Amino acid sequence: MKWDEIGKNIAKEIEKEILPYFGRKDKSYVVGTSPSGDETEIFDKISEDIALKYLKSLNVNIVSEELGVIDNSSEWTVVIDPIDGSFNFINGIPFFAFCFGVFKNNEPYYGLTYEFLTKSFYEAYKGKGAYLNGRKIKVKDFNPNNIVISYYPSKKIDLEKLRNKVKRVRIFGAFGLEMCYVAKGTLDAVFDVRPKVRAVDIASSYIICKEAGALITDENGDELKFDLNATDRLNIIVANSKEMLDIILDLL
Amino acid sequence: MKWDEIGKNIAKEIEKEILPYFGRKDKSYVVGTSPSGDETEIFDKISEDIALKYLKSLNVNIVSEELGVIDNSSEWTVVIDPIDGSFNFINGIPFFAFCFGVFKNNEPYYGLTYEFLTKSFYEAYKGKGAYLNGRKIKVKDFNPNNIVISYYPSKKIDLEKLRNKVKRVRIFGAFGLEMCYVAKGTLDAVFDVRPKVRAVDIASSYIICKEAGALITDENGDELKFDLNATDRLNIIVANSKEMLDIILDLL
Ligand SMILES: O[C@H]1[C@H](O)[C@@H](O)[C@H](O)[C@@H](O)[C@H]1O
Ligand SMILES: O[C@H]1[C@H](O)[C@@H](O)[C@H](O)[C@@H](O)[C@H]1O
Numbered sequence A, B: 001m002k003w004d005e006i007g008k009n010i011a012k013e014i015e016k017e018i019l020p021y022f023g024r025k026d027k028s029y030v031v032g033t034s035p036s037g038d039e040t041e042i043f044d045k046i047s048e049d050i051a052l053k054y055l056k057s058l059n060v061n062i063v064s065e066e067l068g069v070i071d072n073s074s075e076w077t078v079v080i081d082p083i084d085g086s087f088n089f090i091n092g093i094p095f096f097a098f099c100f101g102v103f104k105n106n107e108p109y110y111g112l113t114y115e116f117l118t119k120s121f122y123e124a125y126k127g128k129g130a131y132l133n134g135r136k137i138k139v140k141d142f143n144p145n146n147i148v149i150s151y152y153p154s155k156k157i158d159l160e161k162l163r164n165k166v167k168r169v170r171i172f173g174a175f176g177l178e179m180c181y182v183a184k185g186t187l188d189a190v191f192d193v194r195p196k197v198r199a200v201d202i203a204s205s206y207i208i209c210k211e212a213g214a215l216i217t218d219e220n221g222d223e224l225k226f227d228l229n230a231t232d233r234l235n236i237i238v239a240n241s242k243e244m245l246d247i248i249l250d251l252l
């Protein structure tokens, strides 16, 4: 059973257990507060549990938004965001996804990202190409007019500066899956200078952007580095290229 | 035949023959320039071309994005947008719909709005009430500590103010469909004062929205009143309650 066979299973299973919850704002209570502050809706937990029901038997560490960490001493740890974008999901906004990330000794091994309503498996092995349902995806070739980013800026962020250079603005309110929309050349880039995105949100899509050509810098335009934890919020800047990144970095 | 049945029929046909196309930015390409200006792309013309098949035997007036406007000197006028949010559609962003607005002597009569990705019919008869797939829909009870608005601003639009007063930005690139979201209680609002939206984007939802209880309006809040042609761009502010309208108006 390969790592994707693992992930893919989990995601499909999760798919069926929780789709009748999409929009159903009346069907979901909160079951508790998680490490990062965020509230765990029952839809959230339920998804993470199916994940836990598979990775439980194996000897591996776990990182997972709701539940937090579960160190098992292995040179293998998985990072799952059981639902990337609980909001959109409960408010019937069709921008959610499942995030599965595997790390051998804190190093990129294989990232799974499943966007439920498209049936789109975004996955990629460390050094082996980033794909889309098989099809070979890669970031987009920059265009100094046709830029199309999605942002989550800070107060100090000059907005008019940005918006004048950007050709199209989108903001789908799920940063992981938005990364993958960079992964395939849809989006030119997507940042978040308002430290919110935790490890568990960007893990699986970290690995895929890498294997697709994205840059994935931090605030000061430096090679983003992070720790495997369901805590600590950080500044990420996934991008299309230098030039793009260039553009971003300054406006901040 | 009941309009609603005719609206649904066309929709299904459209989805039958272009959902395959979804995301495949390769297979498509520009085909003409629309009267409004815009570039017509094959999926668009394929979609429209299927509409007119059904709506030309009816000998009704017809008005749509690509072709423009066919005058049959009837009391009845169909207004069509074969794909709302082309861009996203041809670029894997799962946010796009079919807009079927039927007018009785330049006066709202019926409205269909179809979210292909979600199997969601947004329909409304004048004086009947806004429906989603059966369930009855209304906007959402305002709450300043929880606004969720989408928007497309120009120059004189204080972005400082907006993001600071609101609690969640969600820009989606499909105004027509966004209207149905500001009509089912997903967003508190969505305005477009970067005059790009046209009759064919709003029309069918202008209905649905109203009966759902929203307060559509123009620049200076004086109720939205539009002609029925494929050109003539026009500001607009589909709002939750008056507070929203206020706020949108304040910032403006
Ligand atoms: O789109 C984001 C997201 O939904 C976050 O959960 C919220 O805290 C932010 O303020 C909003 O802008
Ligand atoms: O969402 C819209 C849209 O997709 C248009 O194509 C683009 O010209 C606008 O700049 C963008 O904000």
Ligand SMILES: [Mn+2]
Pocket (backbone or CB within 6 Å): A038, A039, A086
């Ligand atoms: Mn959360």
Ligand SMILES: [Mn+2]
Pocket (backbone or CB within 6 Å): A044, A065, A081, A082, A083, A084, A085, A086
């Ligand atoms: Mn989550």
Ligand SMILES: [Mn+2]
Pocket (backbone or CB within 6 Å): A081, A083, A084, A085, A176, A200, A201
């Ligand atoms: Mn998440």
Ligand SMILES: [Mn+2]
Pocket (backbone or CB within 6 Å): B038, B039, B065, B086
């Ligand atoms: Mn267009």
Ligand SMILES: [Mn+2]
Pocket (backbone or CB within 6 Å): B065, B081, B082, B083, B084, B085, B086
């Ligand atoms: Mn269109």
Ligand SMILES: [Mn+2]
Pocket (backbone or CB within 6 Å): B081, B083, B084, B085, B176, B200, B201
């Ligand atoms: Mn449109």
